[PDB]
Amino acid sequence: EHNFNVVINAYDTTIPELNVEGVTVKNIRAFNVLNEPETLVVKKGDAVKVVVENKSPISEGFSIDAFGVQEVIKAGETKTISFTADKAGAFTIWCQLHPKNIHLPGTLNVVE
Amino acid sequence: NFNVVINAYDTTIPELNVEGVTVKNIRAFNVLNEPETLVVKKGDAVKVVVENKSPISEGFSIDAFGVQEVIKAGETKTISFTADKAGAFTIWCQLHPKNIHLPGTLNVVE
Amino acid sequence: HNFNVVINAYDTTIPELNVEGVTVKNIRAFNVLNEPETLVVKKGDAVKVVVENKSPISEGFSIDAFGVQEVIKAGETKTISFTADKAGAFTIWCQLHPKNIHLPGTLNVVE
Ligand SMILES: [Cu+2]
Ligand SMILES: [Cu+2]
Ligand SMILES: [Cu+2]
C-alpha cells in the first residue's frame, strides 16, 4: 500500500417515512455522490498516487487545481492518479462534472 | 484523545428571505460527526470519545482497524485502537445511508 | 501560512437527471460549502486563513477551541488568524446557518 484508495459511490435515498425507536422523520430525499475517503493527508514533497475506483453509475470527476489534476473516471473504471505534492497547504478535491453540493468535495492536505 | 459529537439535523424551510435573497423548498435531514476528520501518526494509540446527541442510536466504524460501535441515543462511548497502518480511512455509520449520516475520515500519517 | 478558504452557496434543483442512460428524479439540495473544508496544521503553528465569502449573504466561520467566531459579509474577504496551541481535531462551523445546510469542516492540529 504505497498509495491511497478512493471509492466514488452514488447514493439515491428516498425515505418518505422513517420511525426508528419511536423517533420519526418524514420526506427524506437525498441524492449524492461521495468520495470515500474524502480527505487525503500527505507530507510536502511526497509522491502521491491515488487509485480511484468509480462505482457511480455515471462518469465521475476528480480534480485538484493546485497540482493540475483533472481526471474523468468512467463508470465502473479504476484510474490511478499520480502527482507530486510540491506545495504545502489545503486543496479542494472536487468533481468538475456535477454540482458540488451533489457530488460533495474533499480535501488534500499537504503538511510541512 | 479525540472528542466527536454526533448530531442530527432536521431542517425544513419552504421559504425564507434573508438580505434580499430568497431560498425555497429546503428539506434536509442529516446526522453529522463533529469533527468529521481525525488525523494521527502511524503507530500511536487513538482514543476517541464519541458522544451521541442524536435521538436514535448511531454507528461509528473504521474497517481498517476493526472499529465498529453502536452508540445508544444520548450515550457516550470511548473508542480505542492503534493506527498501525498509514493511509486514509473512511469513518462511517453502518446503520444509516451514507448520504444521510455523512462519512468522515481518519488519516494516519507516517 | 495563509490558507485559502472559499465559502460558496449552491441552490441545486434537478427535477430529472438524465446522463449516460441513468435516471434520477426529484433532486433538490441547497448547501453552503467551505472549500476546502479541512485544514491540517502542527501544534504551535501561527494560522492565517483568508476567507473569501462568495455566498450572497453573511457567512460564519467559527472554531470554538481557539475562540474563532467570525462573520464574513456577503462577497467580502476576511483574514482570520490564531495560534493552534492545542493538538486535536476541531470543528470548523457556521454559527449563522443549520449545520446540515452549511456543512462543517475540520481544523486538525497534529503534534
Ligand atoms: Cu461527480
Ligand atoms: Cu448514523
Ligand atoms: Cu453559513
XYZ file of C-alpha atoms and ligand atoms in Angstrom:
336
model
C 0.000 0.000 0.000
C 2.194 2.815 -1.316
C -0.941 4.641 -2.428
C -4.405 5.879 -1.485
C -7.590 4.033 -2.378
C -10.669 6.139 -3.027
C -14.052 4.724 -3.991
C -16.587 7.027 -5.601
C -20.113 5.892 -4.689
C -23.561 7.140 -5.695
C -26.386 7.281 -3.131
C -30.047 7.542 -4.112
C -32.036 7.855 -0.887
C -35.811 8.182 -0.766
C -37.425 7.597 2.617
C -40.798 9.358 2.871
C -41.263 7.936 6.371
C -38.750 6.734 8.961
C -39.610 5.764 12.523
C -36.682 4.327 14.459
C -37.008 3.674 18.187
C -40.115 5.864 18.308
C -38.454 8.865 16.630
C -39.985 9.933 13.303
C -38.544 11.745 10.279
C -40.623 12.431 7.167
C -39.996 13.153 3.486
C -36.305 12.341 3.222
C -34.924 12.583 -0.294
C -31.222 12.993 -0.993
C -29.070 12.045 -3.955
C -25.295 12.383 -3.641
C -22.010 11.074 -4.952
C -19.287 10.644 -2.342
C -15.518 10.174 -2.399
C -14.526 7.605 0.230
C -12.464 8.603 1.975
C -12.840 12.360 1.284
C -9.660 13.536 2.983
C -6.094 12.681 1.962
C -3.190 13.932 4.088
C 0.424 13.879 2.906
C 3.805 15.486 3.528
C 5.257 18.172 1.272
C 7.333 16.592 -1.480
C 5.574 13.229 -1.188
C 4.891 11.426 -4.437
C 1.136 10.903 -4.338
C -0.711 8.057 -6.016
C -4.492 7.821 -5.733
C -6.246 4.729 -7.050
C -9.753 5.950 -7.796
C -12.433 3.337 -8.350
C -15.635 4.840 -9.741
C -18.608 2.779 -8.546
C -21.045 5.509 -9.544
C -23.431 4.668 -12.427
C -22.027 7.592 -14.414
C -18.684 9.153 -15.296
C -17.176 10.943 -12.309
C -14.560 13.662 -11.993
C -11.546 14.081 -9.710
C -9.791 17.463 -9.576
C -7.152 19.229 -7.516
C -6.320 22.547 -9.178
C -3.121 23.222 -7.249
C -1.384 20.261 -8.892
C -3.015 20.336 -12.299
C -5.015 17.202 -11.512
C -8.230 16.848 -13.526
C -9.456 13.379 -14.451
C -12.693 11.739 -15.577
C -13.149 8.134 -14.431
C -15.699 6.150 -16.425
C -18.472 4.295 -14.602
C -17.009 1.129 -13.118
C -13.489 2.022 -14.243
C -10.459 2.383 -11.962
C -7.845 5.020 -12.659
C -4.606 5.716 -10.833
C -3.923 9.409 -10.451
C -0.398 10.438 -9.553
C 1.319 13.746 -8.858
C 3.937 15.246 -6.560
C 2.714 17.329 -3.620
C 5.268 20.095 -4.204
C 3.153 22.658 -2.348
C 2.116 22.813 1.320
C -1.484 23.736 2.143
C -5.107 22.588 1.818
C -6.592 21.985 -1.617
C -10.155 21.132 -2.581
C -10.709 17.758 -4.223
C -13.775 18.189 -6.435
C -15.746 16.801 -9.348
C -15.811 19.037 -12.412
C -18.843 17.248 -13.857
C -21.544 17.702 -11.211
C -22.875 20.331 -8.777
C -20.562 20.467 -5.760
C -23.404 20.020 -3.262
C -24.441 16.837 -5.092
C -21.037 15.234 -5.509
C -19.546 16.623 -2.280
C -15.900 17.845 -2.277
C -12.997 16.517 -0.242
C -9.589 17.878 0.715
C -5.935 17.178 0.012
C -3.828 18.425 2.912
C -0.097 18.761 2.319
C 1.681 19.336 5.608
C 5.225 20.637 6.119
C -7.862 11.650 22.968
C -10.426 12.996 20.487
C -13.952 14.300 21.070
C -16.589 13.650 18.419
C -20.192 14.713 18.887
C -22.814 13.075 16.675
C -25.651 15.486 15.902
C -28.838 15.018 13.892
C -30.385 17.911 11.969
C -33.996 18.058 10.784
C -34.147 21.103 8.501
C -37.281 22.129 6.595
C -37.674 25.584 5.073
C -40.346 26.055 2.398
C -39.426 29.726 2.014
C -37.230 32.311 3.672
C -35.750 35.655 2.693
C -32.502 36.967 4.139
C -30.637 40.078 2.957
C -32.917 40.142 -0.069
C -32.030 36.580 -1.036
C -34.912 34.102 -1.142
C -34.437 30.368 -0.726
C -37.267 27.888 -1.179
C -38.211 24.272 -0.604
C -35.283 23.297 1.575
C -35.688 19.813 3.041
C -32.674 18.081 4.529
C -32.201 15.504 7.243
C -28.650 14.534 8.205
C -26.594 13.182 11.049
C -23.039 14.508 11.341
C -19.837 13.633 13.199
C -18.280 16.781 14.677
C -15.441 16.926 13.960
C -15.618 14.865 10.774
C -11.884 14.396 10.254
C -9.290 12.822 12.555
C -5.549 12.926 11.872
C -2.897 10.845 13.667
C 0.612 9.493 13.068
C 1.266 5.833 12.287
C 1.786 3.715 15.378
C 0.205 5.892 18.051
C -2.759 4.806 20.159
C -6.051 6.532 19.491
C -8.837 7.204 21.978
C -11.991 8.721 20.512
C -14.717 9.801 22.929
C -17.925 9.676 20.895
C -20.932 11.488 22.378
C -24.171 10.679 20.573
C -26.667 13.544 20.730
C -28.847 12.013 18.026
C -32.387 10.953 19.051
C -31.616 7.428 17.841
C -28.702 5.019 18.147
C -25.813 5.809 15.786
C -22.870 3.919 14.340
C -19.139 4.672 14.215
C -16.969 2.422 12.028
C -13.440 2.250 10.629
C -12.904 -1.067 8.860
C -9.104 -0.910 8.581
C -8.784 -1.026 12.360
C -11.777 -3.250 13.055
C -13.658 -0.420 14.741
C -17.454 -0.660 14.751
C -19.711 0.511 17.542
C -23.357 1.316 18.116
C -23.881 4.216 20.488
C -27.336 4.476 22.027
C -29.084 7.839 21.877
C -27.759 10.241 24.500
C -24.910 7.835 25.257
C -21.145 8.321 25.183
C -18.696 5.595 24.208
C -14.896 5.620 24.149
C -13.355 4.011 21.068
C -9.706 2.983 21.318
C -7.356 1.426 18.774
C -3.869 1.630 17.340
C -3.259 3.255 13.971
C -0.754 0.597 12.902
C -1.294 1.423 9.226
C -0.712 4.644 7.316
C -3.323 5.920 4.902
C -6.768 7.490 4.673
C -9.709 5.528 6.056
C -13.438 6.212 5.948
C -15.206 6.811 9.262
C -18.800 5.732 8.648
C -22.129 4.851 10.218
C -23.223 1.287 9.460
C -26.830 1.978 10.484
C -27.875 4.783 8.156
C -27.487 5.735 4.475
C -24.062 7.208 3.725
C -25.579 10.417 2.356
C -27.822 10.898 5.398
C -25.222 10.351 8.109
C -22.259 11.868 6.265
C -18.905 9.986 6.442
C -15.674 11.377 7.855
C -12.021 10.416 7.561
C -9.279 9.043 9.781
C -5.907 9.972 8.334
C -2.854 8.093 9.566
C 0.256 9.974 8.520
C 3.685 8.353 8.507
C 0.951 30.130 6.252
C -2.245 31.613 4.885
C -4.785 29.056 3.755
C -7.439 29.977 1.213
C -10.973 29.027 2.104
C -13.812 29.947 -0.219
C -17.409 29.807 1.015
C -19.853 29.009 -1.813
C -23.630 28.716 -1.848
C -25.334 26.101 -4.029
C -29.030 26.186 -4.911
C -29.488 22.949 -6.839
C -32.800 21.724 -8.266
C -32.898 18.866 -10.787
C -36.444 17.541 -11.449
C -34.967 14.777 -13.565
C -31.325 13.893 -14.025
C -30.555 12.034 -17.235
C -26.972 11.193 -18.093
C -25.320 8.243 -19.831
C -28.540 6.235 -19.603
C -29.075 6.777 -15.867
C -32.201 8.435 -14.463
C -32.527 10.042 -11.019
C -35.551 12.110 -10.026
C -36.629 14.914 -7.704
C -33.179 16.169 -6.805
C -33.151 19.221 -4.561
C -30.291 20.369 -2.364
C -29.337 23.771 -1.018
C -25.995 23.965 0.767
C -23.138 26.297 1.600
C -19.649 24.804 1.416
C -16.225 25.835 2.714
C -13.683 24.927 0.027
C -11.503 23.385 1.288
C -13.340 22.007 4.353
C -10.257 20.608 6.100
C -7.199 22.413 7.402
C -4.304 20.493 8.932
C -1.576 22.278 10.879
C 1.023 21.468 13.520
C 0.696 22.353 17.203
C 2.143 25.778 17.925
C 1.727 26.991 14.345
C 0.511 30.519 13.651
C -2.524 30.039 11.434
C -3.795 32.527 8.866
C -6.946 31.764 6.891
C -8.023 34.073 4.103
C -11.774 33.508 3.994
C -13.460 34.631 0.786
C -17.273 34.701 1.041
C -18.901 34.105 -2.354
C -22.239 33.482 -0.666
C -24.966 36.074 -1.409
C -25.431 36.533 2.350
C -23.342 36.822 5.519
C -21.490 33.630 6.425
C -19.947 32.352 9.627
C -16.544 30.819 10.353
C -16.047 29.508 13.901
C -13.586 27.283 15.743
C -14.532 27.143 19.414
C -11.208 25.747 20.677
C -9.362 28.870 19.555
C -12.015 31.495 20.166
C -12.615 31.952 16.462
C -16.134 33.300 15.933
C -16.256 35.356 12.768
C -18.841 36.681 10.324
C -17.929 37.396 6.692
C -20.169 39.848 4.852
C -21.535 38.665 1.515
C -18.905 38.963 -1.206
C -16.189 40.137 1.185
C -12.859 38.668 2.271
C -11.597 38.415 5.822
C -8.286 37.191 7.162
C -8.629 35.096 10.280
C -5.517 34.308 12.301
C -4.761 32.476 15.527
C -2.201 30.187 17.134
C -3.028 26.481 17.229
C -1.711 25.909 20.763
C -3.701 22.694 21.288
C -3.472 19.407 19.418
C -6.598 17.590 18.278
C -9.476 17.789 15.802
C -11.755 20.805 15.992
C -14.931 21.587 14.124
C -14.968 24.489 11.655
C -18.603 25.558 11.530
C -21.015 28.334 10.605
C -22.874 29.792 13.610
C -25.429 31.528 11.361
C -26.977 28.615 9.467
C -28.026 24.978 10.046
C -25.052 22.598 10.224
C -26.530 20.364 7.522
C -27.107 23.263 5.093
C -23.734 24.956 5.605
C -21.674 21.786 6.100
C -18.912 21.815 8.796
C -15.204 21.221 8.243
C -12.237 20.393 10.464
C -9.109 22.040 11.807
C -6.607 19.316 12.626
C -3.676 20.236 14.847
C -1.193 17.348 14.930
C 1.751 17.115 17.334
Cu -19.168 13.790 -9.781
Cu -25.784 7.157 11.731
Cu -23.233 29.690 6.751
